[PDB]
Amino acid sequence: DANSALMELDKGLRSGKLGEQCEAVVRFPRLFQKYPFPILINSAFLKLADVFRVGNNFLRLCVLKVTQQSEKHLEKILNVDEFVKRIFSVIHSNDPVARAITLRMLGSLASIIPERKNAHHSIRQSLDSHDNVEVEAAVFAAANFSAQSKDFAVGICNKISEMIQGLATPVDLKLKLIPILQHMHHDAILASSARQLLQQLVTSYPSTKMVIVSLHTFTLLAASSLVDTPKQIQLLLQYLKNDPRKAVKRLAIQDLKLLANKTPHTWSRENIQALCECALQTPYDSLKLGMLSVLSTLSGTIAIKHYFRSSDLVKLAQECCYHNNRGIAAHGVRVLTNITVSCQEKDLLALEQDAVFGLESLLVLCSQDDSPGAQATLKIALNCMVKLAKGRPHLSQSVVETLLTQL
């Protein structure tokens, strides 16, 4: 029986021994999986909150782990007020560890208590505490509550700004503190203020870790709050062509990959032109391969029709088609094939044979080595020539002939 098993693991949490008590606490998610009944999940969560209120910090951490593992079941408790109140009663503990665990509880419960103002005030007060674990837990709770509540976000944006430009805050806690601005995707003026703060923040703290974290949270804000995307793309391209560090360029590359995977239609022709110009004058194959991966992701979408003779993208694809790196060759062949099968202009008749012979050269390079990385480029090339044969029928004879000669 459900209630019989509930009593069976309920008798263990007055055992006095901490081991059987943590036993009793951590058996709860299995009970929630077996018996998803709201009147029973309610009673289980209320007594979990009671043993959270009276237990030590390890029991509180066990309750926190249970709450994290049972996030989909805590929307069906419906005695929210007294449960949250008896958890919240030990925000007033003088123990900073207990305060940190309660902040992690509030952040874990932020899906079912948005606009709960005493929780917001506790997070705001604990963000200025002198204990590192409490401040980290307050940052975690603020990140959770900013995602679930816009009234929390509008004031906490100003607070996080003022404690980022506050130099008493150390650099590592600043690094943990930047991605709160990712959840500013509630209001247009809120996202604009967050973008202004991030623009001042990148040039104010030009550290490599700072620019990685700030650019990634700026692009997560731009992807979530959709009216930020062209300026974010042009900012990423500017930081890809100007910032000399390889890590910053690598984040710019993977970030433009994310933005091309999400919203390829919002790329302008100038953005593709700037990315191509970045791929021309780079000396590193590790960055050129990533840039060509972004351009090959863009090539399989409608961004080519927005981009469109022989342009910088075509010249770049021809140059990267004949490259000693197999990945760069595969990406250039993919761009050439997508351009060839995308439209039927007069200019692509010349590069059709270029795509065919680049495919054949990639086949003769990727077949005799049996490397694990060679098979991926071989699969890319063979998929590209399948697409070339299907999209344009007449030249399939040469593709079949070179496959037979390579076999």
Partner: peptide, 13 residues
């Protein structure tokens, strides 16, 4: 209780 300040708000069940 050692975990709470004397001036901390009381808990009323």
């Amino acid at each position: 209780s050692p975990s709470y300040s004397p001036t901390s708000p009381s808990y009323s069940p």
